[PDB]
CSV table of C-alpha atoms in Angstrom, one decimal:
chain,number,residue,atom,x,y,z
A,1,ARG,CA,100.4,-44.6,-18.4
A,2,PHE,CA,100.3,-41.2,-16.7
A,3,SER,CA,101.7,-38.6,-19.1
A,4,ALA,CA,105.4,-38.0,-18.5
A,5,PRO,CA,106.7,-35.3,-21.0
A,6,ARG,CA,110.4,-34.6,-21.3
A,7,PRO,CA,111.2,-31.9,-18.6
A,8,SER,CA,111.4,-28.2,-19.3
A,9,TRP,CA,114.9,-27.7,-18.1
A,10,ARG,CA,115.9,-24.1,-17.4
A,11,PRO,CA,119.0,-22.7,-15.7
A,12,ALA,CA,118.7,-22.6,-12.0
A,13,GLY,CA,118.5,-19.2,-10.5
A,14,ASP,CA,121.6,-17.8,-9.1
A,15,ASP,CA,119.5,-16.9,-6.1
A,16,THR,CA,119.3,-20.6,-5.2
A,17,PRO,CA,121.7,-23.1,-3.8
A,18,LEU,CA,121.3,-24.8,-7.2
A,19,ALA,CA,123.2,-22.0,-9.1
A,20,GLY,CA,125.0,-23.5,-12.1
A,21,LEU,CA,122.6,-26.5,-12.4
A,22,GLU,CA,119.4,-27.0,-14.4
A,23,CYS,CA,115.9,-27.1,-12.9
A,24,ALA,CA,112.5,-28.5,-13.9
A,25,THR,CA,109.4,-30.1,-12.4
A,26,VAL,CA,107.7,-33.3,-13.3
A,27,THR,CA,103.9,-33.7,-12.8
A,28,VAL,CA,102.8,-36.6,-10.7
A,29,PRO,CA,99.2,-37.6,-9.6
A,30,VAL,CA,98.6,-37.2,-5.9
A,31,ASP,CA,96.9,-40.6,-6.0
A,32,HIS,CA,98.6,-42.8,-8.6
A,33,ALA,CA,95.3,-44.9,-8.8
A,34,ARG,CA,93.5,-41.7,-9.9
A,35,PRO,CA,95.5,-40.3,-12.8
A,36,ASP,CA,92.7,-37.9,-13.7
A,37,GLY,CA,92.7,-36.4,-10.2
A,38,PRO,CA,94.8,-33.7,-8.6
A,39,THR,CA,98.6,-33.5,-9.3
A,40,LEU,CA,101.6,-31.9,-7.9
A,41,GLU,CA,105.0,-30.8,-9.3
A,42,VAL,CA,108.1,-32.7,-8.2
A,43,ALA,CA,111.2,-30.5,-8.3
A,44,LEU,CA,114.3,-31.8,-10.1
A,45,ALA,CA,117.9,-30.5,-10.3
A,46,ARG,CA,120.3,-31.7,-13.0
A,47,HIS,CA,124.1,-31.6,-13.5
A,48,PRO,CA,124.5,-32.9,-17.1
A,49,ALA,CA,127.2,-35.4,-17.9
A,50,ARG,CA,130.5,-33.6,-18.6
A,51,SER,CA,131.5,-35.8,-21.5
A,52,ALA,CA,129.1,-36.8,-24.3
A,53,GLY,CA,131.3,-39.7,-25.4
A,54,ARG,CA,131.3,-41.0,-21.8
A,55,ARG,CA,127.7,-40.4,-21.1
A,56,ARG,CA,125.8,-43.6,-20.4
A,57,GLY,CA,122.6,-42.3,-18.9
A,58,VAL,CA,121.1,-40.7,-15.8
A,59,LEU,CA,122.0,-41.2,-12.1
A,60,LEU,CA,118.8,-40.4,-10.3
A,61,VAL,CA,119.5,-39.3,-6.7
A,62,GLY,CA,116.9,-39.6,-3.9
A,63,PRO,CA,116.7,-37.5,-0.7
A,64,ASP,CA,118.8,-38.6,2.2
A,65,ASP,CA,116.1,-38.1,4.9
A,66,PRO,CA,112.3,-37.6,4.8
A,67,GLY,CA,111.7,-33.9,4.3
A,68,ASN,CA,115.3,-33.1,3.3
A,69,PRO,CA,115.3,-31.7,-0.3
A,70,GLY,CA,117.1,-34.2,-2.6
A,71,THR,CA,117.8,-31.5,-5.1
A,72,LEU,CA,120.4,-30.1,-2.7
A,73,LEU,CA,122.4,-33.3,-2.9
A,74,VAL,CA,123.3,-32.4,-6.5
A,75,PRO,CA,125.8,-29.6,-5.6
A,76,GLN,CA,127.3,-31.9,-2.9
A,77,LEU,CA,127.8,-34.7,-5.5
A,78,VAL,CA,129.3,-32.3,-8.0
A,79,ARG,CA,131.8,-31.4,-5.3
A,80,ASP,CA,132.7,-34.9,-4.1
A,81,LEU,CA,131.9,-37.5,-6.8
A,82,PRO,CA,134.8,-39.1,-8.7
A,83,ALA,CA,135.3,-37.1,-11.9
A,84,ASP,CA,134.5,-40.1,-14.1
A,85,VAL,CA,131.0,-40.5,-12.6
A,86,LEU,CA,130.3,-36.8,-13.4
A,87,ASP,CA,131.6,-37.4,-16.9
A,88,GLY,CA,129.4,-40.4,-17.5
A,89,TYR,CA,126.1,-39.5,-15.9
A,90,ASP,CA,123.6,-36.8,-15.8
A,91,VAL,CA,123.1,-36.4,-12.0
A,92,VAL,CA,119.4,-35.7,-11.3
A,93,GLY,CA,118.2,-35.1,-7.8
A,94,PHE,CA,114.6,-34.7,-6.7
A,95,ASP,CA,112.6,-33.3,-3.8
A,96,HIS,CA,110.2,-36.0,-2.8
A,97,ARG,CA,106.5,-35.2,-2.9
A,98,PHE,CA,105.3,-32.9,-0.1
A,99,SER,CA,108.8,-31.6,0.8
A,100,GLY,CA,111.4,-29.1,-0.4
A,101,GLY,CA,110.2,-27.5,-3.6
A,102,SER,CA,107.6,-30.2,-4.3
A,103,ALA,CA,104.4,-28.9,-2.8
A,104,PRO,CA,105.8,-28.5,0.8
A,105,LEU,CA,103.2,-28.6,3.6
A,106,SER,CA,102.7,-25.9,6.3
A,107,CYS,CA,100.5,-26.9,9.2
A,108,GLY,CA,101.1,-24.2,11.8
A,109,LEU,CA,103.5,-26.4,13.9
A,110,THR,CA,105.6,-24.6,16.4
A,111,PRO,CA,109.4,-25.1,16.4
A,112,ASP,CA,109.1,-27.4,19.4
A,113,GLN,CA,106.6,-29.6,17.4
A,114,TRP,CA,109.1,-29.6,14.5
A,115,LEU,CA,111.3,-31.8,16.8
A,116,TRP,CA,108.5,-34.3,17.5
A,117,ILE,CA,110.9,-37.3,16.8
A,118,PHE,CA,113.5,-36.2,19.4
A,119,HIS,CA,111.2,-34.4,21.9
A,120,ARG,CA,112.2,-35.2,25.4
A,121,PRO,CA,109.1,-36.4,27.3
A,122,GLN,CA,107.8,-35.8,30.9
A,123,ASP,CA,105.6,-38.9,31.2
A,124,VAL,CA,103.6,-41.2,29.0
A,125,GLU,CA,100.3,-39.2,29.5
A,126,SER,CA,101.8,-35.7,28.7
A,127,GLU,CA,103.7,-37.1,25.8
A,128,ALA,CA,100.7,-38.8,24.3
A,129,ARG,CA,99.0,-35.4,24.4
A,130,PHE,CA,102.0,-33.6,22.9
A,131,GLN,CA,102.4,-36.1,20.1
A,132,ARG,CA,98.7,-36.3,19.3
A,133,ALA,CA,98.5,-32.5,19.1
A,134,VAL,CA,101.1,-32.7,16.3
A,135,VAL,CA,99.0,-35.2,14.4
A,136,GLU,CA,95.8,-33.2,14.9
A,137,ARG,CA,97.4,-30.0,13.6
A,138,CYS,CA,98.8,-31.7,10.6
A,139,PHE,CA,95.6,-33.5,9.6
A,140,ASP,CA,93.6,-30.4,10.2
A,141,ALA,CA,95.8,-28.5,7.7
A,142,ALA,CA,96.9,-31.3,5.3
A,143,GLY,CA,94.7,-34.4,5.9
A,144,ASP,CA,93.6,-34.4,2.3
A,145,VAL,CA,97.2,-35.1,1.1
A,146,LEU,CA,99.0,-36.8,4.1
A,147,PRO,CA,97.6,-40.2,3.2
A,148,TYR,CA,99.4,-40.0,-0.1
A,149,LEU,CA,102.8,-39.2,1.5
A,150,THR,CA,104.4,-42.7,1.7
A,151,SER,CA,107.6,-44.3,0.6
A,152,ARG,CA,105.8,-46.4,-2.0
A,153,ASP,CA,104.1,-43.3,-3.5
A,154,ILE,CA,107.6,-41.7,-3.7
A,155,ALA,CA,108.8,-44.8,-5.6
A,156,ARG,CA,105.9,-44.4,-8.0
A,157,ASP,CA,106.9,-40.8,-8.6
A,158,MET,CA,110.5,-41.9,-9.2
A,159,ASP,CA,109.3,-44.1,-12.0
A,160,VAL,CA,107.3,-41.2,-13.5
A,161,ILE,CA,110.5,-39.1,-13.4
A,162,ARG,CA,112.4,-41.9,-15.1
A,163,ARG,CA,109.8,-42.0,-17.9
A,164,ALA,CA,109.9,-38.2,-18.2
A,165,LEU,CA,113.7,-38.5,-18.6
A,166,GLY,CA,113.4,-41.0,-21.4
A,167,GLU,CA,115.5,-43.7,-19.7
A,168,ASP,CA,114.2,-47.3,-20.0
A,169,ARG,CA,116.9,-48.3,-17.5
A,170,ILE,CA,118.1,-45.6,-15.1
A,171,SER,CA,120.8,-45.6,-12.5
A,172,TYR,CA,120.2,-44.6,-8.9
A,173,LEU,CA,122.2,-43.4,-5.9
A,174,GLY,CA,120.6,-43.0,-2.5
A,175,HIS,CA,121.8,-42.5,1.1
A,176,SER,CA,120.0,-43.3,4.3
A,177,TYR,CA,116.3,-42.7,3.6
A,178,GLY,CA,117.4,-42.6,-0.1
A,179,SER,CA,118.7,-46.2,0.3
A,180,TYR,CA,115.2,-47.2,1.3
A,181,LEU,CA,113.6,-45.3,-1.5
A,182,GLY,CA,116.0,-47.0,-3.9
A,183,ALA,CA,115.3,-50.4,-2.5
A,184,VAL,CA,111.5,-49.9,-2.7
A,185,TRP,CA,111.8,-48.5,-6.2
A,186,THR,CA,113.8,-51.6,-7.3
A,187,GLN,CA,111.3,-53.9,-5.7
A,188,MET,CA,108.4,-52.2,-7.6
A,189,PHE,CA,110.1,-51.2,-10.9
A,190,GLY,CA,113.5,-53.0,-10.9
A,191,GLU,CA,113.4,-54.1,-14.5
A,192,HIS,CA,114.0,-50.4,-15.1
A,193,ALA,CA,117.2,-50.2,-13.1
A,194,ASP,CA,120.6,-49.9,-14.8
A,195,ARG,CA,123.1,-49.6,-11.9
A,196,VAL,CA,122.1,-49.0,-8.3
A,197,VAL,CA,124.1,-47.8,-5.3
A,198,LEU,CA,122.5,-47.8,-1.9
A,199,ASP,CA,124.7,-46.1,0.8
A,200,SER,CA,124.2,-46.1,4.6
A,201,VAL,CA,121.5,-48.7,4.4
A,202,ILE,CA,118.2,-48.6,6.3
A,203,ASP,CA,117.2,-52.0,7.7
A,204,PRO,CA,113.8,-52.8,6.2
A,205,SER,CA,113.0,-54.8,9.3
A,206,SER,CA,113.2,-51.6,11.3
A,207,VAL,CA,110.6,-49.5,9.4
A,208,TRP,CA,109.9,-47.4,11.4
A,209,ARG,CA,109.4,-47.6,15.2
A,210,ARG,CA,112.3,-50.1,15.5
A,211,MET,CA,114.6,-47.6,13.9
A,212,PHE,CA,113.7,-45.1,16.6
A,213,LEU,CA,114.5,-47.6,19.3
A,214,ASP,CA,117.8,-48.4,17.6
A,215,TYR,CA,118.7,-44.7,17.5
A,216,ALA,CA,118.7,-44.8,21.3
A,217,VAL,CA,121.0,-47.8,21.4
A,218,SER,CA,123.4,-46.3,18.9
A,219,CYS,CA,123.4,-42.9,20.6
A,220,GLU,CA,124.1,-44.3,24.0
A,221,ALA,CA,127.0,-46.4,22.8
A,222,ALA,CA,128.6,-43.6,20.8
A,223,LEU,CA,128.1,-41.1,23.7
A,224,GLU,CA,129.9,-43.6,26.0
A,225,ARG,CA,132.9,-43.7,23.6
A,226,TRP,CA,132.9,-39.9,23.1
A,227,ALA,CA,133.0,-39.5,26.9
A,228,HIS,CA,136.2,-41.4,26.9
A,229,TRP,CA,137.6,-39.3,24.0
A,230,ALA,CA,136.7,-36.2,25.9
A,231,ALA,CA,138.1,-37.4,29.2
A,232,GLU,CA,141.5,-37.7,27.5
A,233,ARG,CA,141.1,-34.0,26.5
A,234,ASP,CA,140.4,-32.6,30.0
A,235,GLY,CA,143.3,-30.1,29.5
A,236,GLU,CA,141.3,-28.3,26.7
A,237,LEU,CA,137.7,-29.2,27.7
A,238,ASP,CA,137.8,-29.3,31.5
A,239,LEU,CA,134.8,-31.7,31.5
A,240,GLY,CA,136.5,-34.4,33.6
A,241,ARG,CA,139.4,-36.9,33.4
A,242,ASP,CA,137.2,-40.0,33.2
A,243,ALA,CA,134.1,-40.9,31.1
A,244,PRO,CA,131.5,-40.9,34.0
A,245,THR,CA,132.5,-37.4,35.0
A,246,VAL,CA,132.3,-36.1,31.5
A,247,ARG,CA,128.9,-37.8,31.0
A,248,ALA,CA,127.6,-36.4,34.3
A,249,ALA,CA,128.5,-32.9,33.1
A,250,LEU,CA,126.7,-33.4,29.8
A,251,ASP,CA,123.6,-34.8,31.6
A,252,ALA,CA,123.4,-32.0,34.0
A,253,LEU,CA,123.8,-29.5,31.1
A,254,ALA,CA,121.0,-31.1,29.1
A,255,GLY,CA,118.7,-31.3,32.1
A,256,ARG,CA,119.2,-27.6,32.8
A,257,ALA,CA,118.3,-27.0,29.1
A,258,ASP,CA,115.2,-29.0,29.5
A,259,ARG,CA,114.0,-26.6,32.2
A,260,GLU,CA,115.2,-23.3,30.7
A,261,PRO,CA,116.7,-23.0,27.3
A,262,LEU,CA,120.4,-22.1,27.1
A,263,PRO,CA,121.1,-18.9,25.2
A,264,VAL,CA,123.8,-19.6,22.6
A,265,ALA,CA,124.5,-16.6,20.3
A,266,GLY,CA,121.0,-15.4,21.1
A,267,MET,CA,119.3,-18.7,20.1
A,268,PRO,CA,117.4,-20.5,22.9
A,269,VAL,CA,118.8,-24.0,22.9
A,270,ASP,CA,116.5,-26.4,24.8
A,271,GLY,CA,117.4,-30.0,25.8
A,272,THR,CA,115.7,-31.6,22.8
A,273,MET,CA,117.8,-29.4,20.5
A,274,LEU,CA,121.0,-30.0,22.5
A,275,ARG,CA,120.6,-33.8,22.4
A,276,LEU,CA,119.8,-33.8,18.7
A,277,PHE,CA,122.8,-31.6,18.0
A,278,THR,CA,124.9,-34.0,20.1
A,279,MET,CA,123.7,-37.1,18.2
A,280,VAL,CA,124.4,-35.5,14.8
A,281,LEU,CA,128.0,-34.5,15.9
A,282,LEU,CA,128.6,-37.9,17.4
A,283,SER,CA,127.7,-39.5,14.1
A,284,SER,CA,131.0,-38.4,12.5
A,285,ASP,CA,134.3,-38.8,14.4
A,286,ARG,CA,135.5,-35.8,12.4
A,287,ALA,CA,132.9,-33.7,14.2
A,288,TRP,CA,133.8,-34.8,17.8
A,289,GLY,CA,135.7,-31.6,18.3
A,290,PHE,CA,132.6,-29.5,17.6
A,291,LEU,CA,130.9,-31.5,20.3
A,292,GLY,CA,133.7,-31.0,22.8
A,293,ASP,CA,133.6,-27.3,22.0
A,294,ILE,CA,129.8,-26.8,22.5
A,295,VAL,CA,129.8,-28.9,25.7
A,296,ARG,CA,132.9,-27.1,27.1
A,297,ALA,CA,131.4,-23.7,26.2
A,298,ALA,CA,127.9,-24.3,27.6
A,299,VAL,CA,129.1,-26.0,30.8
A,300,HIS,CA,131.6,-23.2,31.7
A,301,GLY,CA,129.6,-20.2,30.5
A,302,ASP,CA,132.2,-19.4,27.8
A,303,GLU,CA,131.8,-18.8,24.1
A,304,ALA,CA,131.9,-21.6,21.6
A,305,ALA,CA,134.0,-21.2,18.4
A,306,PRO,CA,132.2,-19.4,15.6
A,307,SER,CA,132.2,-22.5,13.5
A,308,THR,CA,130.4,-24.4,16.2
A,309,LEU,CA,127.9,-21.6,16.5
A,310,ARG,CA,127.3,-21.6,12.7
A,311,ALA,CA,126.6,-25.4,12.9
A,312,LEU,CA,123.9,-24.7,15.4
A,313,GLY,CA,122.6,-21.9,13.2
A,314,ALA,CA,122.5,-24.2,10.2
A,315,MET,CA,120.6,-26.8,12.2
A,316,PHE,CA,118.1,-24.6,14.0
A,317,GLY,CA,118.4,-21.1,12.5
A,318,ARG,CA,116.7,-19.3,9.7
A,319,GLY,CA,117.1,-22.1,7.2
A,320,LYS,CA,115.2,-24.7,9.2
A,321,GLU,CA,111.8,-25.5,7.5
A,322,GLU,CA,108.5,-26.7,9.1
A,323,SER,CA,107.9,-28.6,5.9
A,324,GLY,CA,110.6,-31.1,6.7
A,325,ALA,CA,108.9,-32.1,10.0
A,326,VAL,CA,105.6,-32.7,8.3
A,327,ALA,CA,107.3,-34.8,5.7
A,328,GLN,CA,108.9,-36.9,8.4
A,329,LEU,CA,105.5,-37.3,10.1
A,330,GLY,CA,103.8,-38.5,6.9
A,331,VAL,CA,106.5,-41.0,6.0
A,332,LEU,CA,107.4,-42.3,9.4
A,333,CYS,CA,103.8,-42.6,10.6
A,334,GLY,CA,102.2,-43.5,7.3
A,335,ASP,CA,104.4,-46.3,5.9
A,336,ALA,CA,103.4,-48.8,8.6
A,337,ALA,CA,101.0,-48.8,11.5
A,338,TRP,CA,102.6,-48.0,14.8
A,339,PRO,CA,101.5,-50.0,17.9
A,340,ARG,CA,98.3,-48.5,19.3
A,341,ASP,CA,98.6,-50.1,22.9
A,342,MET,CA,99.7,-47.3,25.3
A,343,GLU,CA,101.0,-50.2,27.5
A,344,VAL,CA,103.6,-50.9,24.9
A,345,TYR,CA,104.9,-47.4,25.3
A,346,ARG,CA,104.7,-47.5,29.1
A,347,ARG,CA,106.6,-50.8,29.1
A,348,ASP,CA,109.3,-49.6,26.7
A,349,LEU,CA,109.8,-46.2,28.4
A,350,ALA,CA,110.6,-48.1,31.6
A,351,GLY,CA,112.7,-50.7,29.9
A,352,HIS,CA,114.5,-49.8,26.7
A,353,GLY,CA,114.1,-46.1,27.5
A,354,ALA,CA,115.7,-46.4,30.9
A,355,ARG,CA,118.5,-48.7,29.6
A,356,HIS,CA,119.5,-46.0,27.0
A,357,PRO,CA,118.8,-42.8,28.9
A,358,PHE,CA,120.2,-40.1,26.6
A,359,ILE,CA,117.4,-40.3,24.0
A,360,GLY,CA,115.8,-43.6,25.0
A,361,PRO,CA,112.6,-42.0,26.4
A,362,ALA,CA,112.2,-39.9,23.3
A,363,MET,CA,112.5,-42.9,21.1
A,364,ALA,CA,110.5,-45.5,23.1
A,365,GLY,CA,107.5,-43.4,24.2
A,366,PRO,CA,104.1,-42.8,22.6
A,367,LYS,CA,105.1,-41.1,19.3
A,368,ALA,CA,102.7,-39.5,16.8
A,369,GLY,CA,102.4,-42.7,14.8
A,370,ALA,CA,100.5,-44.4,17.6
A,371,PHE,CA,97.6,-41.9,17.1
A,372,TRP,CA,97.5,-41.9,13.3
A,373,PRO,CA,93.9,-41.3,12.1
A,374,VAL,CA,94.0,-43.2,8.9
A,375,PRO,CA,94.8,-46.9,8.3
A,376,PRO,CA,97.9,-47.9,6.3
A,377,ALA,CA,97.2,-47.7,2.6
A,378,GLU,CA,99.4,-50.6,1.6
A,379,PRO,CA,101.6,-53.2,3.3
A,380,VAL,CA,105.1,-52.2,4.0
A,381,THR,CA,107.3,-53.1,1.1
A,382,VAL,CA,108.8,-56.6,1.2
A,383,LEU,CA,112.2,-56.9,-0.4
A,384,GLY,CA,113.1,-60.3,-1.6
A,385,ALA,CA,114.2,-62.8,-4.3
A,386,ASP,CA,111.7,-61.5,-6.9
A,387,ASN,CA,113.5,-58.1,-7.0
A,388,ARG,CA,114.2,-57.6,-10.7
A,389,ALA,CA,117.1,-55.1,-10.5
A,390,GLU,CA,120.1,-56.6,-12.3
A,391,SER,CA,122.6,-55.4,-9.7
A,392,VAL,CA,122.7,-53.4,-6.5
A,393,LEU,CA,125.9,-52.2,-4.8
A,394,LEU,CA,125.6,-51.5,-1.0
A,395,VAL,CA,128.1,-49.2,0.7
A,396,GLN,CA,128.2,-49.0,4.5
A,397,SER,CA,130.3,-47.6,7.3
A,398,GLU,CA,131.2,-50.0,10.0
A,399,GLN,CA,130.1,-47.5,12.7
A,400,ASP,CA,127.1,-45.6,11.5
A,401,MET,CA,124.8,-43.8,14.1
A,402,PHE,CA,121.8,-43.4,11.9
A,403,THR,CA,121.8,-46.5,9.8
A,404,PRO,CA,123.8,-49.2,11.7
A,405,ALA,CA,125.8,-51.7,9.6
A,406,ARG,CA,123.4,-54.5,10.5
A,407,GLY,CA,120.9,-52.9,8.1
A,408,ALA,CA,123.2,-53.3,5.2
A,409,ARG,CA,123.8,-56.9,6.1
A,410,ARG,CA,120.1,-57.4,6.3
A,411,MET,CA,119.6,-55.9,2.8
A,412,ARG,CA,122.4,-58.2,1.6
A,413,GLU,CA,120.4,-61.2,2.9
A,414,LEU,CA,117.0,-60.0,1.6
A,415,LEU,CA,118.4,-59.2,-1.8
A,416,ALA,CA,121.0,-62.0,-1.8
A,417,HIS,CA,120.6,-62.7,-5.5
A,418,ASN,CA,121.5,-59.2,-6.9
A,419,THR,CA,123.6,-57.4,-4.2
A,420,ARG,CA,127.2,-57.0,-3.1
A,421,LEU,CA,128.4,-55.1,-0.1
A,422,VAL,CA,131.4,-52.8,0.4
A,423,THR,CA,132.0,-52.0,4.1
A,424,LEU,CA,134.4,-49.3,5.3
A,425,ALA,CA,136.1,-50.5,8.4
A,426,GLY,CA,137.4,-48.0,10.9
A,427,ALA,CA,134.9,-45.3,9.7
A,428,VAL,CA,132.7,-43.5,12.1
A,429,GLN,CA,130.4,-41.9,9.6
A,430,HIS,CA,127.0,-41.7,8.0
A,431,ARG,CA,126.8,-41.2,4.2
A,432,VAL,CA,130.0,-42.6,2.8
A,433,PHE,CA,130.1,-42.6,-1.0
A,434,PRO,CA,131.3,-40.1,-2.0
A,435,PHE,CA,131.2,-37.5,0.8
A,436,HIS,CA,133.6,-39.2,3.2
A,437,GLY,CA,136.4,-38.9,0.6
A,438,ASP,CA,137.7,-42.5,1.0
A,439,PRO,CA,139.7,-43.2,-2.2
A,440,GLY,CA,139.1,-47.0,-2.0
A,441,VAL,CA,135.3,-46.7,-1.5
A,442,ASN,CA,135.0,-44.0,-4.1
A,443,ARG,CA,136.9,-45.8,-6.7
A,444,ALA,CA,135.0,-49.1,-6.1
A,445,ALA,CA,131.6,-47.4,-6.4
A,446,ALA,CA,132.7,-45.4,-9.4
A,447,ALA,CA,134.0,-48.5,-11.1
A,448,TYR,CA,130.7,-50.3,-10.5
A,449,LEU,CA,128.7,-47.3,-11.8
A,450,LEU,CA,130.8,-47.0,-15.0
A,451,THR,CA,131.4,-50.7,-15.8
A,452,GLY,CA,128.5,-52.5,-14.1
A,453,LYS,CA,130.7,-55.1,-12.4
A,454,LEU,CA,130.0,-55.8,-8.7
A,455,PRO,CA,133.0,-56.9,-6.7
A,456,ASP,CA,133.5,-60.7,-6.7
A,457,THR,CA,132.6,-61.1,-3.0
A,458,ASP,CA,131.6,-58.7,-0.3
A,459,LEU,CA,134.6,-56.4,0.4
A,460,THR,CA,135.8,-54.8,3.6
A,461,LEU,CA,138.0,-51.8,3.0
A,462,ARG,CA,140.1,-50.2,5.7
A,463,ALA,CA,139.5,-46.5,6.1
A,464,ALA,CA,142.4,-44.5,4.7
A,465,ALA,CA,143.9,-41.9,7.0
């Protein structure tokens, strides 16, 4: 096997968001079929179990989105996990290969190209050119390694990390993209799983273009609901007293931003940025006030609240990294071949795209993956009855923008033999355990992690107030 020495843990710098934790890297081969070839260093962050008598092993935590550093989940989990989980597990997060602190890639993409997923198009021809230019730039700069940026290669890295940690059976928690990494790792290596929690569950049948199409459906429906919520708040927002009037104001605002970016605290906010910010805020009903605030401010030429501004600054300001967009490109284009027929995209722009107009065209048109210059290395992972994980708990919000609840139900079908599902009804949220703070969900998931017992049948919990 590829050599996996025990990690060289050191205190995290107090110049990092990981202050207070421990850091190390694990070597992995770029090509797992060529262990004598080039390697990279995968960054880890650890919060050691608080209680030696309660410690049962390691809770490995994957990234929640391609390109998003999974090490940064560790502080969030220290903040929000039930205390007994933090007593019983070393929490170890990682930055997946070619992201974060794990050999991040830089390809000369401009900020507009960083938003290739959500980029608002003009027509099929211009968008094909825009999306192909992203691919060209990335392969020119990183074409030697991009073919090795896939979900299955990340899963292989997870198993090297497990071996380096010295755990024959390791536990796992992953959210969103991390749910998919966990599922893939269990399908490839599940005899090495202890307890596994997958939260906000990607539908395997959606990998990946269908997920984009579903984003447009989910966004449209959520925006229709938010427009009603905003119409009831015309006193404070002055956006209209019925949902069509509110939506027309937002559409006109976003169209203006498509033609000339809106200055917001000195940041040029174009339509792609505004619609992405909108979708993110829509995904949590606790954030709907931020959305009312930015739309009110931008429509009326007034100032948004400082907290709203700081949310835009966090999303698009100094901390935004090109490397995340390149990581998204590799995973989302590389895991499966996208349709190559331009007529598919023409059809779907006029159909799906027009039926879901807020982001439908951005989702349905000729994305980068259509132009990918290498074949798929491997089939997409097939989850099924041969999965060797002893047990998997699925946790899912009933109303989840980014990973609709149908995906958790699909996972519960594909992995019928070893899964149980906990659904949080009444929640409008993405990433539930533990960040939403629901006592019922958090205690059910903690009890599974600490005792290994799945609930007797799938459970629907009612979101506490």
